[PDB]
Design a protein around this ligand. Structure first.
Ligand SMILES: Nc1ncnc2c1ncn2[C@@H]1O[C@H](CSCC[C@H](N)C(=O)O)[C@@H](O)[C@H]1O
Length: 227
């Protein structure tokens, strides 16, 4: 009934069923995170001069991954910019729903956009790796003991010179609960370099245009993979 309820119950399934708790959550329609749109900071960054640095350096094979994509708004958005984009969720339900939601999209028709039931930690990183990965409500969905493997995986998935964009949310302080887990740029930083040797944090801003409930709980951070 209430979002507070859906969260409490979602955390109940997580404790009972682990990562399998996600496909049931999607099937039962317990999806309090789902907004129906990309977060505004993502579009604003991309249409910035800072983000137009990214999209004009793209080759024609520029590959985006959106892990934990849910109904895949963010994956759709990147596809429309010409990026050959993969949206990956653990839950086939979520990824069927994404296929419906985006059924009319020219990118889904043309294959430029693509949804696929994958375990972020398990699937075969392709030979060419990814030029761009976008993490939103994925890092904060993970239990704390999965933040280092998250970071280690991020290191293999992004080719050197690639970009990892992390909309860090929710920055809620000490909230001792999850999902969604209270995170901050420091928790992301530690996970990404297990003074930091695998990434440079090129840009770390508070977006000018957050969703109203995101205001003051959110920072866009852009990481460059370096070797
Ligand atoms: N190992 C894993 N691999 C891929 N997806 C995972 C995963 N563990 C959890 N997830 C998925 O990450 C999502 C957490 S919430 C959905 C977040 C989505 N990015 C959005 O903005 O709507 C769920 O869809 C869950 O199925």
């Amino acid at each position: 009934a209430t979002r507070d309820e859906k969260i409490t119950y979602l955390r109940k399934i997580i404790g009972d069923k682990g990562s399998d708790a996600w496909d049931v959550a999607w099937q039962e329609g317990v999806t309090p995170w789902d907004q129906g749109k990309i977060q505004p900071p993502l579009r604003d960054f991309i249409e910035s001069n800072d983000g137009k640095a990214l999209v004009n350096k793209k080759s024609d094979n520029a590959r985006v991954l959106v892990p934990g994509c849910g109904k895949g708004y963010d994956a759709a958005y990147f596809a429309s910019l010409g990026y050959e984009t993969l949206g990956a969720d653990l839950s086939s339900t979520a990824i069927e729903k994404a296929k419906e939601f985006w059924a009319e999209s020219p990118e889904l028709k043309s294959g430029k956009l693509s949804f696929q039931t994958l375990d972020f930690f398990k699937f075969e990183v392709p030979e060419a790796k990814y030029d761009l990965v976008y993490d939103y409500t994925f890092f904060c969905a993970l239990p704390p003991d999965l933040r280092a493997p998250w970071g280690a995986r991020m290191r293999e998935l992004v080719r050197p010179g690639g970009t990892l964009i992390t909309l860090v949310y929710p920055i809620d302080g000490a909230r001792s609960g999850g999902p969604p887990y209270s995170i901050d740029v420091q928790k992301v930083t530690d996970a990404l370099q297990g003074p930091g040797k695998y990434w440079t944090k090129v840009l770390d801003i508070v977006p000018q245009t957050s969703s109203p409930d995101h205001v003051g709980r959110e920072r866009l951070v852009v990481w460059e993979r370096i070797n």
